[PDB]
């Protein structure tokens, strides 16, 4: 053609057609072949993408995910669909069914967690539900009665078992838990992970995604799998992990999300007359983690830093996670204006060569930047959506609209890619990525 | 709410979400519970609804339908999905696998046909394909190489076995073959069908659709099932049906569709360098049936009449089938202007009480009109789409746009109903009707 | 016939067509016949309306208004179009040309003021300009250079001459300064306005709007025109009005708008490197007037109260001005929930008879309510846009969107009415109202 | 920066803003500076542009034009705005006021004609009026009553005084009458135009458009202005022009437009019960001019040829005027397929360097092609709209839609240019061109 792009109605139709095609029945895979199981924070966004189409089916997505919740509250980052292959590491390597005392009985799950965006999904379902009338409000509200206690247990587990010293920051024991697997953020902590006798394995992800420049390297995967052996050797016991894991970092992006989530959950809890003590705790957590995020920021730029617990040192990198405090609030006026100038300037959204005015995962002027390699440079619709929605919540209506408009424009070819090359716009990663389709549907409300 | 309607992007998304949810794998049911199998002219419209979403999946819908084609060319009106129940009459009553010499080996089908809209689906797939670039044009074009000969056999069977005297009109042996089961069109022919020893049966359609005023009556169903016994007793042999069937009528609406279809197939055949003899025959048929439709029309109003072969009399009724000549062309200038005035006036689209300016299936001032009862009055999106698309083909751009706009407005509540009450807009029939969702997607291109 | 509403592009086109049709060259009349001159806060919304069409002409609109600013900083509420009559009271009745020491010389203006929404217009122009490229950005930055000093003198005149005791609320000397001429808010205050020898006059407004139920009474105009005589007798001198004016009320809605306008101007001042002393003054007024608004609020509902300076009494009425604190923030979390609940509940937006989910000027359950009568009941697009824009600034993205979407639906008949009957939707006041067209252009984008 | 294009509602608003900005009161200038008067076929498109905005003002536009009609029926191609200069040749140079027996008295006009697109404007007004209700319908029906006799005298003057031998083609006495002033179509004819003692002059057009590559040469203007002297020497007398004019060509594009215009007027005449004798005349001219167009056509491609009356020779050029028969129909099926194939192929719309799938005025492979130079290459929104509307009338719904969609994409930069560089998209000619704005308003609806 002369134009290979789609109209907004065509695009919304194709996006809904992808989400239904990735539906197994009660769960939606993050991707048809690359990720043929339910991932934790993908399921939350799939629920957002489904809320315009069927509030009852979006409630089901979350229902299915909470039924995989561990006995201590942890929401695992993968719920394995029964009998599916083609993804490594599968439940055999995790062995949580055998080893994890808190693992659920009805499901096969991984042994690590992922950021708590689930409250954001609940509010979007609620907002759609209130525009659809009496029968549909009842479905969302019944969900709240079924799962409020389980949402609380999820937030309580993060606040108490992953913030053991009440520092207002979430501790991670695997890079995978950040959702940003190979981010330059973790390079200096992964450098101190020394794999021992690691059992033989073959990769699956790079049989599907065959370009080596779009996925993590083989050395990187050996370390991801070694941390798994460490957790296994201790039967996934929370009390014992701090003493054995050779990867312990406080994730500032994860912490900022949790702050926002607690605040969102707190407001839902007020709107629907939930136990006062739960609401007060949620507000408590929301402020502790807001303050924890702010304690990491550079005094001049506002840029948030992660923290290496084993090294006892701030990790200074130039990735989009520096902008964590923009999501949760709490910076002094002057510092937040400096942080926004960093975001809008030539190190990020204002880099002269970007095809779209979107946020690259790593700054193109960082020595660590790689235009194609997963989290080392590419632009992700997941970050566009999250930043856009959080900005609207801060009251930055025009900034949020600009992100939403550039995201829709990048997505308008219908690739629904996992991520995009920052300079050429080339769709990279998995195509048919549920999460990208869900961003599009939410942006086209 | 204050407004229970959807935006165009929301509506297109919901429509695509319905079509994918009604997908069994290779076939799409006409409706989730009411019609849990593939119907012949529904599959053609589903292919149109799918062409914006996936040209390859729309090709598959047609591929699946032609694989059910009989050995003489007849496309049957139902392809039964294997192991499905909840629809009567199912393959056990038809018994075509046992009795029909021309029945296909790989499928269970009914023993009657349905209007040949399939060429229209092929052109829409082609038009979408040419806007999507080189790989997707190849998929549509390979379809044409696979199935051109089977499309020809389909049109050839209608022209030769259902127009045995070359009168330019299609003969039907069941009301179901018209697609308008209980239309007042057939009342005076059904009155001369006298059921004999008809084996016991229970209805399914009215266990699903429980309001008696939306479906045909019990007396009506006994006659539909009796004609089935007549066809069975003669093993569905084309040569023997004229001598035994107690229902034989020439369908003018069906004939007009066939004329249009031949013309559309002829033009495709020219564009893609198909055998010259096939194209010349298609143009031949297109003009024979155009002329056959025109031979039925009232000299003053242009209204087309059906013909009772057994009675040897014109059937004069006031339903939307009178407007058949508007679809295929061929009327003298003055007669077509009179036919359009009938369509736009108070007997149809201009009736003062219509909620939308759409075409009711039966004129609200006919003695036969029933606002709720299937084809005896309700407004159907299927007719809106067909009339709208045929009008655009005649060059009546503004008329086609007005139909398309009123149809989109009626559909904007998201019911995707089979048909709508003409006065209140109440959604009737099956909800989640594939065909209504496909009209919406095509209208929102 | 079936649906007298316009598509979004038809509506946007008709809105722009209206705004250009009300342009006299360098000023835009607020309405073709009823208000055939430039009104102050109307002109700010016209500028907002023009920013998507022409940044240059939107700057011109503000430049024209600021060229009429008084020498002490006041922006007068009417700038009269040269040689234009048909509005009363016209320049001859105000006599500011001959009496007022501070009046401008190139221009004929009124002698009172109106809410400082101008900072919001400037912000929207700048946001539009930033999306349009370098030439267009230069135009808006040059406007800032030309007018920043004038915008300051405007805010400083309000902060020092209308808040003479640093109470953080703006004192009005005329109901007209509030923009809600006949609101129930002022009835207690007006009843203590006893006119003496008031020079004869004939109204012009009810010659154009002849329905008496849509305009203020003859008795009300007598008090409006008498307040002019009191200011005239003292030559519009600021120092003397507190001694002679029979009408002195602190306006909490005006005050909240000023709080927001100061914060908006202060942030503009920071992004474009205006003098630090000005930015500091602007932040200090933002906070004082936020606090001054909150100090009026009802301890159970959070509803803001106006104050009668002469009687030293709080004015307790049931109008849209109660929601002032939602615009500028500042309420404790719990009272703000209560206030939103009053907004959304059965006394305002959730009232069961309302055609649209919009804010009535006066509550429909108030003894003071009148569905047709100006600010005593009707729904104003004016209020919708302001609340929608301010809610988005608060971070209430979904609330802002529901207001915007109901506004567009009420406007979709293309009447562009000054105000609308809350129960029936009937358009009231002047048609072709510039402000309504501007709101639509801004919402549609 | 990243994307200088406008959304559909922003674009529709800017188009309406432009059209109102070019309104002088009762006439709309074709462009602000370049064409500061009313041009005949421009004014018909402006009327089309205004019908969605105000049926009343669109009627006024046509009424103003028809008030300048000559006494023999000719509609002159320029109606001069009183006291306006800056265009040459102005009223003083034409001298129709003093020389022309048939010129109007209330008005100053040119002395030549232009294509009869007026019937199409009338049709679009009527279609808009029918959707707007009774008051608006009355306005358009009253226009018909007022002007039907004038529209007839217009078509009759063309049919009898410009087709003096009933050949079914319109004779032009000036290239300007064709609306394609410097098209290669006329170069052979112009080379036999030898000017004598031609009174001195200074061009105005290239003072506004100073780039010489976008306008006709000084040599061409000398021939244009000399043809004026030849008509002046004979006082614009129709009977005498055939004897004295050095330029006499039958214009096949003009003729096809007339064929369509007659058919459109004849159908208007039937729907509104105009005199049967007029309707009959209109149908008879529709057919004669259809046949006269077809008689010129190339036997292999179907391409229409203009005819040089003086030299008795067919003019064979490679311009968009070759596709005249597609507008009015009439070609045998096989030659029309060939003609569409030439339109869609590599010499016109399918040329590989074209930025948009639009029709260049001259084929890019022609020796005559010039990408910047007026009608010698550039793409005209004028042509797009006319072909798109006529294709839809032919029943070519998808072809019409692809033209419309490429037109909108080229217009989406908001330049509203007179014509566009075919390879780069650069806007050329006058910006703010009324006709371009009108096309956009009509396409967007």
UniProtKB/Swiss-Prot annotation, chains A, B, C, D:
Regulation: Activity is not dependent on divalent cations, but it is enhanced by Mg(2+).
One GO BP: oligosaccharide metabolic process
Catalytic activity: (2R)-2-O-(alpha-D-glucopyranosyl)-glycerate + H2O = (R)-glycerate + D-glucose
Name by which UniProt lists this protein: Glucosylglycerate hydrolase
Organism: Mycolicibacterium hassiacum (strain DSM 44199 / CIP 105218 / JCM 12690 / 3849)
Induction: Up-regulated in response to nitrogen shock.
pH sensitivity of activity: Optimum pH is 6.0 (tag-less variant). Optimum pH is 5.8 (C-terminally tagged variant).
PANTHER family, sorted: MANNOSYL-OLIGOSACCHARIDE GLUCOSIDASE
């Amino acid at each position: 053609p002369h134009d290979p792009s789609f109209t907004p109605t065509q695009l919304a139709a194709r996006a809904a057609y992808l989400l239904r095609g990735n539906d197994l029945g009660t769960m939606t895979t993050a991707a048809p072949l690359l990720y043929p199981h339910m991932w934790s924070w993908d399921a939350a966004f799939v629920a957002i993408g489904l809320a315009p189409l069927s509030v009852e089916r979006a409630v089901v997505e979350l229902d299915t995910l909470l039924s995989a919740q561990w006995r201590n509250g942890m929401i695992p980052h993968i719920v394995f669909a029964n009998g599916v292959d083609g993804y490594f590491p599968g439940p055999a390597r995790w062995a949580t069914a055998t080893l994890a005392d808190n693992a659920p009985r009805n499901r096969l799950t991984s042994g690590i967690t992922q950021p708590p965006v689930h409250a954001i999904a609940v509010q979007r379902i609620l907002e759609h539900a209130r525009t659809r009338g009496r029968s549909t409000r009842a479905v969302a509200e019944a969900f709240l009665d079924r799962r409020w206690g389980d949402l609380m247990r999820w937030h309580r587990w993060l606040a108490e078992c992953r913030d053991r010293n009440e520092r207002g920051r979430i501790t991670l024991y695997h890079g995978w838990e950040s959702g940003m697997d190979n981010s330059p953020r973790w390079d200096s902590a992964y450098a101190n992970v020394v794999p021992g006798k690691l059992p033989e394995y073959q990769r699956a992800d790079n049989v599907i995604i065959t370009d080596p420049s779009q996925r993590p390297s083989d050395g990187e995967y050996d370390r991801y799998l070694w941390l798994l052996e460490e957790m296994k050797a201790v039967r996934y016991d929370d009390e014992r992990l701090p003493s054995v894991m050779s990867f312990q970092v406080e994730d500032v992006f994860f912490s900022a999300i949790f702050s926002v989530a607690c605040q969102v959950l707190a407001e839902i809890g007020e709107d629907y007359k939930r136990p006062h003590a739960d609401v007060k705790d949620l507000y408590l957590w929301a402020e502790r983690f807001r303050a924890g995020v702010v304690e990491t920021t550079d005094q001049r730029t506002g840029a948030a830093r992660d923290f290496d617990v084993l090294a006892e040192k701030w990790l200074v990198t130039e990735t989009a996670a520096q902008f964590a405090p923009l999501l949760c609030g709490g910076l002094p006026h002057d510092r937040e204006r400096a942080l926004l100038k960093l975001l809008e300037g030539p190190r990020f959204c204002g880099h002269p060569d970007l095809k779209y005015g979107l946020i690259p995962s790593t700054s193109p002027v960082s020595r660590d930047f790689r235009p194609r390699e997963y989290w080392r440079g590419p632009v992700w619709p997941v970050l566009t959506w999250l930043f856009s929605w959080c900005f609207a919540r801060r009251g930055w209506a025009e900034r949020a609209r600009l992100l939403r408009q550039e995201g829709l424009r990048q997505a308008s070819d219908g690739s629904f890619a996992e991520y995009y090359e920052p300079f050429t716009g080339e769709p990279l990663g998995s195509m048919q990525f549920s999460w990208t389709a869900a961003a599009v549907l939410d942006w086209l409300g």
